[PDB]
Write a protein that binds this DNA or RNA. Structure first.
Lengths: 206, 77, 100, 63, 141, 145, 47, 143
RNA sequence: UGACGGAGCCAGCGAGUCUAACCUUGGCCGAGAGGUCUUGGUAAUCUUGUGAAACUCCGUCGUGCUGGGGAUAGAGCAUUGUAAUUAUUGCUCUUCAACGAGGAAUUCCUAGUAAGCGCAAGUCAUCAGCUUGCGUUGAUUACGUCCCUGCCCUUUGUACACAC
RNA sequence: UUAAUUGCGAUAACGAACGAGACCUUAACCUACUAAAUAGUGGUGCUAGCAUUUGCUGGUUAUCCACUUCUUAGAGGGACUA
């Protein structure tokens, strides 16, 4: 690595990250292999990005959403609850500060932690609706891994919304503490509590 | 039930009887930030920023990365 | 003598016939000039309700004027103010002759 | 948590009165060349990988 | 003469004309250099075209981009396409092919909008509704 | 980076202008508690008295509060351009006055009592308790009586 | 006759009606005669 | 190699220039100091009551060298903002004319800019050498 | 994912005076609305780069029917007009209530879409909380079904035919 | 099979028509043609500054020169599911 100088000097940090392999500011996109063999081909890896902002043509066809990175799936999941619509630069500021918090505590790669959290908190089976006539009944069958990850990101998103709502605690660390709790397993956060609630609901109506 | 709240008492003006313990109780903390100071040290968010700046003046902690209404910190290790 | 010819017409196929023609007449002799500028089309927006009374759905229509204007600039002495003023005018085409 | 790995090759069609459930043919990685019919919620197609909580069941159709 | 080429970019309402010439290797927009276009997050997003092959390609090349119109994120999305297209134009005007084909395939195989303009334009609003694909409340009995 | 000692001079309860004043909060916003003074006028008096803005109401000496509240009775003598006063160009006197926390309701009672004796359109409905500003009350404001 | 007006006393040019006027566009007429006139204003009707 | 304001960040430049006028040079005294809202859409005077003026001068001087020919009427809409007009939705409200006029008249005798024909004001050489030299020193203050 | 105040502060559609008085630039005065003297334009040229807002950066605040909210009223400052009182409307100060995510039921929606936000125009001498057009930021969720609400074709039944 | 009596095919039917389709406009691309101080771009002149050491930021219609890529539609090309 040799620093290259031009008519307008630039900080050496970006040049260092641009020398061998492109990454985030200090974070690396490698060593994030998924432990679950059922979630492959659905999470996007090995194609690093700098900022979660991207205007991709992912909503045109059926499965163009498969190549959507995990990180902005959280930011896109945060893009609701009314007045929070828009200003996606806030939606990318929250995640960057969230992974920054996970950097100091549990010094492993935060993006590998949220991937592990997605695998852990992803529900595997769920119940359906059956007419019956007069009364409604629920039948339980399996859930596709595409729906597994899509529901998994949402559970963290609306599990930290009310946790940081009407409280001094901000949403910067509320997402941070929720994802580590789901990853390691604590049975205290909203995501795990809802995951076992539907597991026992499906178990009862198996 | 919606009973009466606890009326949280985050500190807004420092004083010696409570200024002294920050240098002795904050240690042995792996992850530190502004938010943890508010809900655990019972101090204000603005008070946390100046106190951490004063505490980092002693060459123990460093901002590392910081921005508006957020910061990350880690004790001497 | 800075003779400027300005054209204003709605039918897009018509003033182009005029604009091409005056260029051809101005191409005679030498009569140095510039080509036809293309100014933005001033689309007019008139919006009215289809139903006269209040009965019916809230149906709306937008009637539009597409006026196209294209002027030319010519510079030459006094002969051209006589050899260009010959009017190649057609219904729907308006011409504005301004000198200097 | 006893789970089994499930491999899908063929798809039957979308079932259910609401249409949110799909009839999908699924095989097993362990003890392969065994056919068991199972249901699914999310969009599926050929060459996917699925995990089942239980392996001994058979549902023909759902409402 | 002077070796100079010019390109341009597009967005929803943002256009980014770029002036590229051989000099001391400077980058600036609206008189301000690359590290100040004020996205404060998408700063890396606009770094993207000029980092994934290094600074060896910008040793002695001045590029200047003028941006007008569009939203803030739309404005930021304009320079990256202008400099990438200007980078291609410089590769198409002064340097050889073996460097050119490697440069373009690195650009295309990573991101589309680096050189591909987005054709997803807003849909005109329809009568009887606030938005293009929105309708008023019916409220019948 | 200012460190201030908080000795026993701090008090949790305040009493100014014969009204209850709460402490433990910013003095600038603690003066808004006392009725008749709004957010805008609060900072004018706070900066006119040359007192610190970020100090709390509890940690406050007698001289500073006396200096703050002595403005209210006669602010015009204290070089104010005289457009913030709630009682300017009064009918009785014609001068600019600032009714304190206890004369606010006495003033409008006098204002209402002279509207009632005159039996104007704006006064009869005020005695009736209905709308006098022309606002529609046929379908709005049902659940107030 | 004693009269003041001068504050919007404009009627339809072709039917003399003080109903809704479009105006500020050179027509100062009513909506209905604007409809049943055709081929004069906004005739193109591409949209 | 020659540093202008465009080569440095906007926030640190107007802060360094504000501290320059805070410490050196007398800008002017507005008279209605920290008693105005600096606009019509706002209802609270600036928190930096002792300041808000020399940094006001730094911002307008930077922008009057950014732009070419603008007047106080333009300055009102430049620094306007949405006003919470009660129940009505937010609408843009222009800044106070007197505040922008006072700072402009404050800085005329300083020399930061001179009166231009055809409307607006054009930057003088005396008022732009210092406006440009400050940028040549503000980027080296970090180290 | 907030309120407030200071910095960065980017668009598009359209309109605009002749025998009349429209859009208004610049200078000056006033906290503000607003007032005076001129300048440019019958219009891509001048209003207007409509420098708009939502937006981000610096600070204060703090979980408190409180700095959210301005309904409710009082007084004062101006504009429109022959006249404005049941405040036309704008501006300034003060009073600071209900409302703390709304129960049956119901409305719109498959991409720049919904939603958030603003701009131009229609009503206008003045007055947008409406509508018509335009622009900024801009999600998750479907790629299926007729189960409810409706539609089309074929078969069957009808004591209907102004027709369930 | 298609959004479509939209097509194949079958067939006491053949020949047909209207609607849909077809057609037009708008939003899309054109560094391909005419191009254009009522839109601009670069340079040559005058002038202002920063380090002066090579550059950068500007302003200027009678200071001109070259061009239409960015701004404007004219004739046009361009995806028909190849």
């Amino acid at each position: 690595f040799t620093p290259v100088v031009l008519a307008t000097p630039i900080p050496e940090e970006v040049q260092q990250a641009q020398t061998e392999i492109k990454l985030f500011n200090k974070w690396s996109f490698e060593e994030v292999e998924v432990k679950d063999a059922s979630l492959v081909d659905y999470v996007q890896v090995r194609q690093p990005i700098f900022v979660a902002h991207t205007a991709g043509r992912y909503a045109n066809k059926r499965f163009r959403k498969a190549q959507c990175p995990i990180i902005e799936r959280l930011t896109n999941s945060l893009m609701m609850n009314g007045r929070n619509n828009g200003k996606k630069l806030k939606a990318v500021r929250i995640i960057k500060h969230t992974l920054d918090i996970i950097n100091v505590l549990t010094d492993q790669n935060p993006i590998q932690v949220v991937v592990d959290a997605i695998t852990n908190t992803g529900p595997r089976e769920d119940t359906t609706r059956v007419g019956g006539g007069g009364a409604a009944r629920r039948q339980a069958v399996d859930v596709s891994p595409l729906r597994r990850v899509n529901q998994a990101i949402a559970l963290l998103t609306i599990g930290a919304r009310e946790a940081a709502f009407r409280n001094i605690k901000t949403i910067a660390e509320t997402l941070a503490e929720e994802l580590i709790n789901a990853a390691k397993g604590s049975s205290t956060s909203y995501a795990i509590k809802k995951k076992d609630e539907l597991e026992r609901v499906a178990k009862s109506n198996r | 039930k919606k009973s009466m709240k606890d009326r949280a008492q985050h500190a807004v003006i420092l004083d010696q009887e409570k200024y002294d313990r920050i240098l002795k109780e904050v240690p042995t903390y792996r992850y530190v930030s502004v938010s943890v100071l508010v809900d655990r040290l019972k101090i204000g968010g603005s008070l946390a920023r100046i106190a951490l700046r004063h505490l980092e003046k002693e060459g123990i902690i460093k901002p590392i990365s910081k921005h508006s209404k957020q910061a990350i910190y880690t004790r001497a290790t | 003598i800075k003779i400027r010819i300005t054209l204003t017409s709605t039918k897009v196929k018509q003033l182009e016939n005029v604009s091409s023609n005056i260029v051809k007449n101005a191409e005679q002799h030498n009569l140095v000039k510039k080509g036809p500028v293309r100014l933005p089309t001033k689309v007019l927006k008139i919006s009215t309700r289809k139903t006269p009374n209040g009965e019916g759905s809230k149906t709306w229509e937008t009637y539009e004027m597409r006026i196209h204007k294209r002027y030319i600039d010519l510079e030459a002495p006094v002969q051209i103010v006589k050899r260009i003023t010959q009017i190649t005018i057609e219904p729907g085409v308006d011409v504005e002759v301004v000198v200097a | 948590t006893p789970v089994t790995l499930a491999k899908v090759i063929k798809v039957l069609g979308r079932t259910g009165s609401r249409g949110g459930v799909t009839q999908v043919r699924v095989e097993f990685l362990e003890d392969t060349s065994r056919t068991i019919v199972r249901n699914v919620k999310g969009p599926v197609r050929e060459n996917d990988i699925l995990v089942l909580m239980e392996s001994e069941r058979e549902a023909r159709r759902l409402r | 003469a002077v070796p100079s080429v010019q390109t341009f970019g597009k967005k929803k309402s943002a256009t980014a004309v770029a002036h590229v010439k051989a000099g001391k290797g400077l980058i600036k927009v609206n008189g301000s250099p690359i590290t100040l276009v004020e996205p404060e997050i998408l700063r890396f997003k606009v770094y993207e075209p000029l980092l994934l092959v290094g600074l060896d390609k910008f040793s002695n090349i001045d590029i200047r981009v003028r941006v007008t119109g569009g939203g803030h994120v739309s404005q930021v999305y304009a320079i990256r396409q202008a400099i990438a297209k200007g980078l291609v134009a410089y590769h198409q005007k002064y340097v050889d092919e073996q460097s050119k084909n490697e440069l373009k395939k690195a650009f295309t195989s990573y991101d589309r909008t680096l050189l591909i303009a987005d054709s997803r334009r807003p849909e005109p609003k329809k009568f009887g509704g606030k938005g293009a694909r929105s309708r008023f409340q019916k409220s019948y009995r | 980076s200012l460190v201030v000692q908080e000795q026993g001079s701090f008090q949790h309860i305040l009493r100014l202008l014969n009204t209850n004043v709460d402490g433990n909060i910013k003095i600038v916003y603690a003066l808004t508690t006392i009725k008749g003074v709004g957010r805008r006028y609060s900072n004018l008096v706070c900066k006119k008295a040359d007192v610190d803005l970020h100090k709390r109401a509890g940690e406050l000496t007698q001289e500073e509060l006396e200096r703050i509240v002595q403005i209210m009775q006669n602010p015009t003598h204290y070089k104010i351009p005289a457009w913030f006063l709630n009682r300017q160009n009064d009918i009785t006197d014609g001068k600019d006055y600032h009714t304190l926390a206890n004369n606010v309701e006495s003033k409008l009672r006098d204002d209402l009592e002279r509207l009632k004796k005159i039996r104007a359109h704006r006064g009869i409905r005020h005695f009736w308790g209905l709308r006098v500003r022309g606002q529609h009350t046929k379908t709005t404001g049902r659940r107030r009586a | 006759h004693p009269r003041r007006y001068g504050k919007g006393s404009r009627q339809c040019r072709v039917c003399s009606s003080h109903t809704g006027l479009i105006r500020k566009y050179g027509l100062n007429i009513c909506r209905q005669c604007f409809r049943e006139k055709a081929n004069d204003i906004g005739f193109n009707k591409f949209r | 190699p020659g540093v202008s304001v465009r080569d440095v960040a906007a926030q640190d430049f107007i802060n360094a220039y504000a501290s320059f006028l805070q410490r050196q040079g007398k800008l002017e005294v507005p008279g209605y100091v920290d008693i105005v809202k600096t606009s019509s859409g706002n209802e609270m005077p600036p928190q930096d009551a002792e300041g808000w003026f020399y940094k006001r001068a730094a911002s307008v001087a930077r922008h009057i060298y950014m732009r070419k020919q603008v007047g106080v009427g333009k300055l009102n809409k430049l620094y306007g903002g949405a006003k919470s007009r009660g129940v009505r939705p937010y609408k843009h409200i222009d800044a106070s004319g007197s505040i922008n006029r006072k700072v402009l008249q404050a800085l005329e005798k300083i020399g930061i800019v001179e009166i231009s024909p055809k409307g607006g004001r054009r930057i003088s050489e005396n008022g732009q050498r210092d406006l440009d030299r400050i940028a040549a020193q503000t980027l080296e203050e970090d180290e």
